PDB file of C-alpha atoms in Angstrom:
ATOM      1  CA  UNK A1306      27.766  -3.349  -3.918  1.00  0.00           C
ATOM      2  CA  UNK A1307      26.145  -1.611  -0.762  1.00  0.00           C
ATOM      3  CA  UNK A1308      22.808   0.391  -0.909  1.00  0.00           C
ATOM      4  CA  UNK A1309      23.030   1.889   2.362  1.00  0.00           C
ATOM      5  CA  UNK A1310      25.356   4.373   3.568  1.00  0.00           C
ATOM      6  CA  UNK A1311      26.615   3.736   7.335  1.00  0.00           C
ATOM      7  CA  UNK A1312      23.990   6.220   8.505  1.00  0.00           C
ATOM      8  CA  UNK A1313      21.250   5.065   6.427  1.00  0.00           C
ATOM      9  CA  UNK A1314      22.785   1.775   7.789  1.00  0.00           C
ATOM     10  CA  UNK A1315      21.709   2.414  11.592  1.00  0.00           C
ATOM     11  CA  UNK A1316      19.088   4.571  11.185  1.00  0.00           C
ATOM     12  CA  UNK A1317      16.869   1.913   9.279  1.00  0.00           C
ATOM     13  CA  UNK A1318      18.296  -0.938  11.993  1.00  0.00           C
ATOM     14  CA  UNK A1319      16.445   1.427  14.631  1.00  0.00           C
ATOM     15  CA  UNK A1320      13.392   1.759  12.817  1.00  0.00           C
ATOM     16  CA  UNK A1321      13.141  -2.424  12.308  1.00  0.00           C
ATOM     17  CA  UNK A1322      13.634  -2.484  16.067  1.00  0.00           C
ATOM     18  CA  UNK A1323      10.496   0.059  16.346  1.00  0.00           C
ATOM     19  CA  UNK A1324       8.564  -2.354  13.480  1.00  0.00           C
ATOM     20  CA  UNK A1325       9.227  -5.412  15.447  1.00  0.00           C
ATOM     21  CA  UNK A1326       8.734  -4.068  18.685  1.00  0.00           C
ATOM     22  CA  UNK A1327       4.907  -2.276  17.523  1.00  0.00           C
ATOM     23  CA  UNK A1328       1.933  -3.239  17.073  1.00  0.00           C
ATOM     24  CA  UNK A1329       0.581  -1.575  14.045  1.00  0.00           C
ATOM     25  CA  UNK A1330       3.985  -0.499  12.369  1.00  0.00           C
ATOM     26  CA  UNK A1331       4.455  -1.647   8.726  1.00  0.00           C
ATOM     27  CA  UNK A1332       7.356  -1.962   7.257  1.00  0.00           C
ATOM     28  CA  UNK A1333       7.860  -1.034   3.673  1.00  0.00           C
ATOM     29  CA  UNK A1334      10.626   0.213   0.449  1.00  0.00           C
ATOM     30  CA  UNK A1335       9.068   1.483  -1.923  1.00  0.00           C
ATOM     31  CA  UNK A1336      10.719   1.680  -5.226  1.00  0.00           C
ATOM     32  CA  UNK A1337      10.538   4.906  -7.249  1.00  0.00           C
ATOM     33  CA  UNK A1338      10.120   5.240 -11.823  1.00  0.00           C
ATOM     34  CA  UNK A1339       8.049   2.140 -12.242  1.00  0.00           C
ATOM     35  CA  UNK A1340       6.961   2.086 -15.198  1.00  0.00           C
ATOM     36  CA  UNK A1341       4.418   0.315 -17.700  1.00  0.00           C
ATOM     37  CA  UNK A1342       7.690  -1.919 -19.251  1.00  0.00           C
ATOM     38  CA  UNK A1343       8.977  -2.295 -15.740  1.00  0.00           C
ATOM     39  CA  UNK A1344       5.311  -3.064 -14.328  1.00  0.00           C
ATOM     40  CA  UNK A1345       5.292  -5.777 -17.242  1.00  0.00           C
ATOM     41  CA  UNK A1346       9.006  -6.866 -16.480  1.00  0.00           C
ATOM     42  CA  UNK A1347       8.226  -7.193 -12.678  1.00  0.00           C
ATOM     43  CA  UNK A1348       5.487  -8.895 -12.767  1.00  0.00           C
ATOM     44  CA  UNK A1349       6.413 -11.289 -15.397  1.00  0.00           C
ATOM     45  CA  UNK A1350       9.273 -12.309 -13.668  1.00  0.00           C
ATOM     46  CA  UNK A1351       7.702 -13.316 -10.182  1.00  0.00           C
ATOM     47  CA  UNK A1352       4.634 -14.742 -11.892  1.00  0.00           C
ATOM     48  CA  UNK A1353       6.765 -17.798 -13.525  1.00  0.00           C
ATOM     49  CA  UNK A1354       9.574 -17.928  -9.806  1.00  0.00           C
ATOM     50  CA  UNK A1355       6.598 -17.911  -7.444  1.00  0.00           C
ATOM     51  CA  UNK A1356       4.633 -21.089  -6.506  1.00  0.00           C
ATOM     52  CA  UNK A1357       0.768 -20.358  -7.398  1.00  0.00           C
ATOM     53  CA  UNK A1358       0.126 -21.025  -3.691  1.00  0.00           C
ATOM     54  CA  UNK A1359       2.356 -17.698  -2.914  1.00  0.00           C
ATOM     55  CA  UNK A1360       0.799 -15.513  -5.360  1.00  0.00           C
ATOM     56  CA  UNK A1361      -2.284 -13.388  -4.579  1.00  0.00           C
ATOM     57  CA  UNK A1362      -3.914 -10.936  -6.822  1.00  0.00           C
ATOM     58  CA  UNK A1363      -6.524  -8.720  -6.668  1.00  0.00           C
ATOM     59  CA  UNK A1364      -8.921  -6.269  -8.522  1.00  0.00           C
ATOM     60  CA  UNK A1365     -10.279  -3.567  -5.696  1.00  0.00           C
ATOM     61  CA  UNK A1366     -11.717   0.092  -5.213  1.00  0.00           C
ATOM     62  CA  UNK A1367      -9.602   2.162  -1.911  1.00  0.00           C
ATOM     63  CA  UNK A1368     -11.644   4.622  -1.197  1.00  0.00           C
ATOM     64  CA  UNK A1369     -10.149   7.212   1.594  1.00  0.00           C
ATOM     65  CA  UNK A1370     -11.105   9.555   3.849  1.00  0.00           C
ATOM     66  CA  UNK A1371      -8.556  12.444   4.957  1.00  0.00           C
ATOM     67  CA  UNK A1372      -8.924  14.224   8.261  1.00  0.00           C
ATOM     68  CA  UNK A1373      -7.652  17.975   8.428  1.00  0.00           C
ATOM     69  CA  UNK A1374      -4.844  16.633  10.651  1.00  0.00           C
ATOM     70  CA  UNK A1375      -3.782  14.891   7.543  1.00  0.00           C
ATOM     71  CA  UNK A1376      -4.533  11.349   9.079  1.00  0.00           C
ATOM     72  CA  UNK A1377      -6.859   8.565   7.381  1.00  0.00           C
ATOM     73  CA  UNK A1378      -9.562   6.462   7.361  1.00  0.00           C
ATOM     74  CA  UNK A1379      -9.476   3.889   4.474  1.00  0.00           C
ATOM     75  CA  UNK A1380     -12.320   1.464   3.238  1.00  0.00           C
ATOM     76  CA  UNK A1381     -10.629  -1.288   0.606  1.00  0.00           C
ATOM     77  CA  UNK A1382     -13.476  -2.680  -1.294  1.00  0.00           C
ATOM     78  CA  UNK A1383     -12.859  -6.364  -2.961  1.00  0.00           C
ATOM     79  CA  UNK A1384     -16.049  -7.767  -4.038  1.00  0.00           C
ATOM     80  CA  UNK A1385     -16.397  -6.345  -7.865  1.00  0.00           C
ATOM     81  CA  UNK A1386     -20.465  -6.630  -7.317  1.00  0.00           C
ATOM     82  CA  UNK A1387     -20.268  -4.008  -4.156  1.00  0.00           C
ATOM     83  CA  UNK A1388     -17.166  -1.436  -6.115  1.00  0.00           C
ATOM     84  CA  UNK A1389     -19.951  -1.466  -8.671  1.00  0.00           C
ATOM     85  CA  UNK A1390     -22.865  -0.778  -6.496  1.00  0.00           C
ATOM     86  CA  UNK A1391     -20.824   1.653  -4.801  1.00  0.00           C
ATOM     87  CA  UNK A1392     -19.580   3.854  -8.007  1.00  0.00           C
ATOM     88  CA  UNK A1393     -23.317   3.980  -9.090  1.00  0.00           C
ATOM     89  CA  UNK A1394     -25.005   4.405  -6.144  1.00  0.00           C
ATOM     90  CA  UNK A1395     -22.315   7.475  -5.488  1.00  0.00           C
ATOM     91  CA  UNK A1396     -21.534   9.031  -8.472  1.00  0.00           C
ATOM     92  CA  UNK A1397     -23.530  12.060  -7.874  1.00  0.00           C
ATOM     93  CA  UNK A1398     -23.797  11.928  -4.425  1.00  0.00           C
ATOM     94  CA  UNK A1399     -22.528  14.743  -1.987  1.00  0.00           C
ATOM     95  CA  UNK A1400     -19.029  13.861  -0.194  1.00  0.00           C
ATOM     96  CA  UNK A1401     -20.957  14.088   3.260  1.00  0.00           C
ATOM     97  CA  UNK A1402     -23.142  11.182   1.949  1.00  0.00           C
ATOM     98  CA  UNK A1403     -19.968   9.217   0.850  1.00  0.00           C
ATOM     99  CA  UNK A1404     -17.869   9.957   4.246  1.00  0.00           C
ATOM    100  CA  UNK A1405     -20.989   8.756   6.508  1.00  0.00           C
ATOM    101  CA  UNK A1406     -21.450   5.435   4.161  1.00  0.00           C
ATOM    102  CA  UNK A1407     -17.798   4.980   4.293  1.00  0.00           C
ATOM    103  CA  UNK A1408     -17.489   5.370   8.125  1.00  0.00           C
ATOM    104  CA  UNK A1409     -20.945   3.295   8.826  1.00  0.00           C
ATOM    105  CA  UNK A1410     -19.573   0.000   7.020  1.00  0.00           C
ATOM    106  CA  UNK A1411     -18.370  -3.111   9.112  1.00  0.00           C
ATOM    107  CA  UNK A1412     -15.356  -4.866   8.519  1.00  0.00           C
ATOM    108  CA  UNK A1413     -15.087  -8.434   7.033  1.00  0.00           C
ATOM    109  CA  UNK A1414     -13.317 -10.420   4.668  1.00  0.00           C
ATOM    110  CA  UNK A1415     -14.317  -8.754   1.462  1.00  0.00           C
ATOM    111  CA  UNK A1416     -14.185  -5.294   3.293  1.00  0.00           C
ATOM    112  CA  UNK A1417     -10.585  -4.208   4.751  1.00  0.00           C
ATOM    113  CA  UNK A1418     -10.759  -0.736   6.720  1.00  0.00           C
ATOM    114  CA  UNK A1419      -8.071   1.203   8.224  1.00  0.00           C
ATOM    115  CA  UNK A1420      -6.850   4.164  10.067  1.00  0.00           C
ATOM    116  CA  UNK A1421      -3.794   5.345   9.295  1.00  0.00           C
ATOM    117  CA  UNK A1422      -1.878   7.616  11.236  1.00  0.00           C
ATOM    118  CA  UNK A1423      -0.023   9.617   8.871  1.00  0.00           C
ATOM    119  CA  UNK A1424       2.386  12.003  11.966  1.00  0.00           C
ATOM    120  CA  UNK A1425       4.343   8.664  13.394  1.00  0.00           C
ATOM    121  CA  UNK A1426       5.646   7.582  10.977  1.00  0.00           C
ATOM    122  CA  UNK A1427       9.300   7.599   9.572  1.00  0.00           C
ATOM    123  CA  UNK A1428      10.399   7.779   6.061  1.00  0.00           C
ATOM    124  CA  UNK A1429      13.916   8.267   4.641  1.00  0.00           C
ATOM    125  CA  UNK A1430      15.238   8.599   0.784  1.00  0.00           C
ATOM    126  CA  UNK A1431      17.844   6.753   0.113  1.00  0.00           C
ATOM    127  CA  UNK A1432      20.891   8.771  -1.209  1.00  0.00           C
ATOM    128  CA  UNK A1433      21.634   7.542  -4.790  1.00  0.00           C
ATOM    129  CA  UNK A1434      19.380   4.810  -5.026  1.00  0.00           C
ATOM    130  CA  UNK A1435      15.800   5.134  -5.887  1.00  0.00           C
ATOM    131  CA  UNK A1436      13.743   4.149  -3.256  1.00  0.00           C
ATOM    132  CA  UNK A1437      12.324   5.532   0.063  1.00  0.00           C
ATOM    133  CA  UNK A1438      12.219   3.209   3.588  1.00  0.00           C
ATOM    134  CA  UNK A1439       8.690   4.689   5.401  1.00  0.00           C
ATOM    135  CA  UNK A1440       7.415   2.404   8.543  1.00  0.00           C
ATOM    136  CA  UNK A1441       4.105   3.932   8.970  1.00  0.00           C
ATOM    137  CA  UNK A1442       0.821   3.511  11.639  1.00  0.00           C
ATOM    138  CA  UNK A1443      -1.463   1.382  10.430  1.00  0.00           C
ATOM    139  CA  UNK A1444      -4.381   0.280  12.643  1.00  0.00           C
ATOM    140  CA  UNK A1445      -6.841  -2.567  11.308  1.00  0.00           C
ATOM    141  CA  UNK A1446     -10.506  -2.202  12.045  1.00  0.00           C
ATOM    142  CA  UNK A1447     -11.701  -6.048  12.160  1.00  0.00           C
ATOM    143  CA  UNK A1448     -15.063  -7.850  12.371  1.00  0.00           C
ATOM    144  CA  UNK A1449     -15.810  -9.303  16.389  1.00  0.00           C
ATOM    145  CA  UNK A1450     -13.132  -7.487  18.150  1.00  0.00           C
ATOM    146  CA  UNK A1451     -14.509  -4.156  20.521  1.00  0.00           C
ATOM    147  CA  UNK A1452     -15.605  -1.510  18.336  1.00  0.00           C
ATOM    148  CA  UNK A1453     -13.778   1.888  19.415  1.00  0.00           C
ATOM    149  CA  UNK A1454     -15.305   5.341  18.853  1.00  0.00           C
ATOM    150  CA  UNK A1455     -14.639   5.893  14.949  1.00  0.00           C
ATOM    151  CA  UNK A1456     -13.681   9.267  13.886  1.00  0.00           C
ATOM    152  CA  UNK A1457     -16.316  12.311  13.765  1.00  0.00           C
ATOM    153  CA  UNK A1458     -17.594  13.421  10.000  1.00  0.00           C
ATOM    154  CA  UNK A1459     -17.432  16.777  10.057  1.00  0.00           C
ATOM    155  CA  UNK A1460     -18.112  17.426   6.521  1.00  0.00           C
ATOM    156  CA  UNK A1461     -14.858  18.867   5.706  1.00  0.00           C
ATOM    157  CA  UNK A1462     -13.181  15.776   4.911  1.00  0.00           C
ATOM    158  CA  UNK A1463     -11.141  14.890   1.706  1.00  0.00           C
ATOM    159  CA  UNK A1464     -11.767  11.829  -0.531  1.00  0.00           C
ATOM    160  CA  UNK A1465      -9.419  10.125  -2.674  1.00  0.00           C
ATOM    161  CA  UNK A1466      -9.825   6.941  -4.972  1.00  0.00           C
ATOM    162  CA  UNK A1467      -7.831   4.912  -5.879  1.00  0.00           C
ATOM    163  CA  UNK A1468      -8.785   1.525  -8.083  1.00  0.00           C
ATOM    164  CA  UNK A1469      -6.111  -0.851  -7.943  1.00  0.00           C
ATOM    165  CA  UNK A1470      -4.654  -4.142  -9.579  1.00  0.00           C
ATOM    166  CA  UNK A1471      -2.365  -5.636  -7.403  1.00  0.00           C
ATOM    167  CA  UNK A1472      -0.082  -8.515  -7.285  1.00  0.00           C
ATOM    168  CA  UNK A1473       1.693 -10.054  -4.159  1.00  0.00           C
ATOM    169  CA  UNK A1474       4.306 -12.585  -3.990  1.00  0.00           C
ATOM    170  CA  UNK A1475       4.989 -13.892  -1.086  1.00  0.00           C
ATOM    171  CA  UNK A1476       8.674 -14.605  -1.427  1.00  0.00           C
ATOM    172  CA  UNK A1477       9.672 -15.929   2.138  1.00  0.00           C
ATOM    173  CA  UNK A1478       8.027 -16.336   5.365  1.00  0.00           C
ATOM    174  CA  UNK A1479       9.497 -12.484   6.438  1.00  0.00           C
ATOM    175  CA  UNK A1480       8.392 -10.378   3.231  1.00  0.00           C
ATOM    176  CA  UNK A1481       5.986  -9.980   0.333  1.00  0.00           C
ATOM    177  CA  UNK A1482       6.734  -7.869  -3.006  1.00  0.00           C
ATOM    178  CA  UNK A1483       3.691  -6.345  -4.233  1.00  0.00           C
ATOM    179  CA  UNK A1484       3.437  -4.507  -7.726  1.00  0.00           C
ATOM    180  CA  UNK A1485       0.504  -2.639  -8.170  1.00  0.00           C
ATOM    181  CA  UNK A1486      -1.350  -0.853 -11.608  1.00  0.00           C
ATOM    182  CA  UNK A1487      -3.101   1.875  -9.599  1.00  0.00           C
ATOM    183  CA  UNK A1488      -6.181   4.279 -11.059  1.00  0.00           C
ATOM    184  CA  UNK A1489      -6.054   7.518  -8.625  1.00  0.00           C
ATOM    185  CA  UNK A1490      -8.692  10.577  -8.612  1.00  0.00           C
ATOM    186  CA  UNK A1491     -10.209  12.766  -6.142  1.00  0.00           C
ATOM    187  CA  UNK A1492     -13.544  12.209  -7.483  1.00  0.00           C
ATOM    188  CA  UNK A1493     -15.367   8.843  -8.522  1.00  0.00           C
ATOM    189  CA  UNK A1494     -16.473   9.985 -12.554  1.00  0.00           C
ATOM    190  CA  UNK A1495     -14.493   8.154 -14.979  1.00  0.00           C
ATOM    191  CA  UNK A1496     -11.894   6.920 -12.119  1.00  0.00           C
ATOM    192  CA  UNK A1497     -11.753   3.277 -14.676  1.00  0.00           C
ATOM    193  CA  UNK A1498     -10.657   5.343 -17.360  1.00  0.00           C
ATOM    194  CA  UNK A1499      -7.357   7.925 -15.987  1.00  0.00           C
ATOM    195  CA  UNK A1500      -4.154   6.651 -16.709  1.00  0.00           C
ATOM    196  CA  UNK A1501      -2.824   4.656 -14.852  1.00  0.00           C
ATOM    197  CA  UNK A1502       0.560   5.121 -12.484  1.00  0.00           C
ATOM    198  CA  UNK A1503       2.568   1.648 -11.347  1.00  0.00           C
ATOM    199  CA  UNK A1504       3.632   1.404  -7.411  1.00  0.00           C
ATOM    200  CA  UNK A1505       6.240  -1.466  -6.452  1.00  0.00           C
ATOM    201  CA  UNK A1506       7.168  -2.049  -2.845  1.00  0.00           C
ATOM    202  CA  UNK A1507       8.533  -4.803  -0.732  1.00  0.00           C
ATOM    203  CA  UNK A1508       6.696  -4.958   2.795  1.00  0.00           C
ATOM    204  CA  UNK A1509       7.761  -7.082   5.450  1.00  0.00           C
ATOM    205  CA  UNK A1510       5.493  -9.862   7.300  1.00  0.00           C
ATOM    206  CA  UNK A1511       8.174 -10.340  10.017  1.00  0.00           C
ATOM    207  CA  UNK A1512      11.769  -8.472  10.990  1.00  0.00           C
ATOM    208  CA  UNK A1513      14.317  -9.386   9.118  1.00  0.00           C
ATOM    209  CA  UNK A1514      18.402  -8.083   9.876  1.00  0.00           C
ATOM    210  CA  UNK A1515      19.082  -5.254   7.431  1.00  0.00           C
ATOM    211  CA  UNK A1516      21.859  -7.142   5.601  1.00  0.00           C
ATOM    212  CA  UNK A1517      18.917  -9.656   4.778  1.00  0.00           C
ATOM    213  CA  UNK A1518      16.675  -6.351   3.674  1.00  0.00           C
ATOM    214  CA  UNK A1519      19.618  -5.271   1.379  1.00  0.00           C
ATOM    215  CA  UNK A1520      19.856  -8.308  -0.078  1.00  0.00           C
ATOM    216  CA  UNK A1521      16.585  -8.588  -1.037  1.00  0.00           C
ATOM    217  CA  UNK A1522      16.440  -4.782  -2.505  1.00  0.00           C
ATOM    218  CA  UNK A1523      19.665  -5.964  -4.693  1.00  0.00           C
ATOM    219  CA  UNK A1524      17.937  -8.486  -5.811  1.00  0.00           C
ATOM    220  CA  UNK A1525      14.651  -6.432  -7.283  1.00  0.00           C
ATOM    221  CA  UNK A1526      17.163  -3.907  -8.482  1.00  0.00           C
ATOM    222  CA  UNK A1527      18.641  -6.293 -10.862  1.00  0.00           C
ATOM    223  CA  UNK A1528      15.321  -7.001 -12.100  1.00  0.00           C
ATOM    224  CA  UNK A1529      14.127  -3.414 -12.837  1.00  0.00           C
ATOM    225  CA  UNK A1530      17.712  -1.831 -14.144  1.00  0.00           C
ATOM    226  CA  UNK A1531      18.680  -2.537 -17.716  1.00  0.00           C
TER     227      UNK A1531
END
């Protein structure tokens, strides 16, 4: 049983070449119709195979800025005190407001930001198989190192939020499956409260050949099929 066709075969080869030769690339399949039962199944299932000290999970408030070019600037809030301070300090606060709080905050442990530079990156579908392979631009903004000229609010930026659940499982030293209960809306009223939609991927730490990669994606595909 082979998920790749020969031309999905050597066009994903290239693009782990282009993840292991970058320095911001990430690497990531993301699987497609997950579900609450499959969420449940999922997560069930590498809770009791993972070792506690490979399991990470986390409660935390994404809150993103989007640049007319379609690029973005993301803040990932993970102290519950501060996503609380935030969503009633902002509620009814103008979007200009938001943008220049989100752009003025420093990175550190509890605060992750990012700029993500939606135009290099490379996604394919996969024919017959549901999943999509994207390596995507994704530069971290970190506490001591040289701060570079952030980007210029010009008050017509969009803002999306997204409050997520995640949980990562670190199953080797090369990749990580993270399933993720996520809470999306473009405007911070009630954002606890929408329904919520259920994202699964499997992200690589390090390369790793593809016939490894579609090993691994066989593997989580016997988990979520019936």
């Amino acid at each position: 049983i082979t998920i790749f066709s020969e031309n999905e075969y050597n066009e994903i080869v290239e693009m782990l070449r282009d993840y292991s030769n970058g320095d911001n690339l990430e690497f990531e399949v993301s699987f497609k119709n997950i579900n609450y039962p499959n969420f449940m199944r999922i997560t069930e299932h590498y809770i009791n195979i993972t070792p506690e000290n490979k399991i990470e999970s986390n409660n935390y408030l994404d809150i993103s800025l989007i640049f007319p070019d379609k690029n973005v600037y993301r803040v990932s809030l993970f102290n519950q005190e501060q996503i609380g301070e935030f969503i009633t300090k902002f509620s009814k606060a103008s979007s200009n407001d938001i943008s220049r709080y989100i752009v003025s905050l420093d990175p550190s442990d509890d605060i992750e930001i990012v700029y993500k530079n939606r135009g290099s990156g490379k996604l394919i579908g996969i024919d017959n198989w549901a999943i999509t392979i994207k390596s995507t631009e994704e530069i971290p903004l970190v506490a001591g190192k040289s701060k570079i000229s952030k980007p210029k609010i010009t008050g017509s930026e969009r803002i999306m939020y997204r409050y997520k659940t995640r949980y990562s499982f670190t199953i080797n030293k090369n990749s990580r499956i993270d399933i993720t209960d996520v809470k999306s809306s473009p405007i911070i009223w009630k954002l606890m409260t929408v329904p919520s939609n259920y994202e699964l991927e499997l992200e690589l730490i390090n390369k790793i050949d593809i016939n490894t990669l579609e090993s691994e994606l066989l593997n989580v595909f016997m988990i979520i099929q019936d």
